[PDB]
Amino acid sequence: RTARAGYRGRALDYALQINVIEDKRKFDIMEFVLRLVEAQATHFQQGHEELSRLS
Amino acid sequence: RTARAGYRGRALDYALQINVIEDKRKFDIMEFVLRLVEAQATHFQQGHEELSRLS
């Protein structure tokens, strides 16, 4: 009665944290390629902002 | 007489190369830098072109 109740208790958490990582996994890697190329656009704009003076 | 005469011509041939060297030193070192900075600027322009559509 202890095992069956606390195993039911546990199957819900395990269902919850699995359901969380499914959503989370896409969003963080997409955010990571997004924040990466922001810094790229920002690094390349710094060398383009002075391209006119340098020419 | 022929030793003194030969010292003088050989002194003119050193004197001429010493003008040639002074411009050679100038334009290779001035050009080396001027190529580096332009090509450096260029990778940032090409970057920025994309990376602003990607932004």
From Swiss-Prot, chains A, B:
Localization per Swiss-Prot or TrEMBL: Recycling endosome membrane
Tissue: Highest level in lung and spleen. Low level in heart, kidney, liver and pancreas.
Entry comment, domain topic: PH domain binds phospholipids including phosphatidic acid, phosphatidylinositol 3-phosphate, phosphatidylinositol 3,5-bisphosphate (PIP2) and phosphatidylinositol 3,4,5-trisphosphate (PIP3). May mediate ACAP1-binding to PIP2 or PIP3 containing membranes. Only one PH domain of one ACAP1 dimer inserts into the membrane, while the other PH domain acts primaryly to interact with adjacent ACAP1 dimers. The BAR domain mediates homodimerization, it can neither bind membrane nor impart curvature, but instead requires the neighboring PH domain to achieve these functions.
Record's function text: GTPase-activating protein (GAP) for ADP ribosylation factor 6 (ARF6) required for clathrin-dependent export of proteins from recycling endosomes to trans-Golgi network and cell surface. Required for regulated export of ITGB1 from recycling endosomes to the cell surface and ITGB1-dependent cell migration.
Other information: Cells overexpressing ACAP1 show an accumulation of ITGB1 in recycling endosomes and inhibition of stimulation-dependent cell migration. Cells with reduced levels of ACAP1 or AKT1 and AKT2 show inhibition of stimulation-dependent cell migration. Cells overexpressing ACAP1 and PIP5K1C show formation of tubular structures derived from endosomal membranes.
Subunit and interaction comment: Banana-shaped homodimer laterally assembling into tetramers, the tetramers further pack helically onto the membrane. Interacts with GTP-bound ARF6. Interacts with third cytoplasmic loop of SLC2A4/GLUT4. Interacts with CLTC. Interacts with GULP1. Forms a complex with GDP-bound ARF6 and GULP1. Interacts with ITGB1; required for ITGB1 recycling.
Protein name per its UniProtKB record: Arf-GAP with coiled-coil, ANK repeat and PH domain-containing protein 1
Section of the entire sequence shown: 160 to 214 of 740
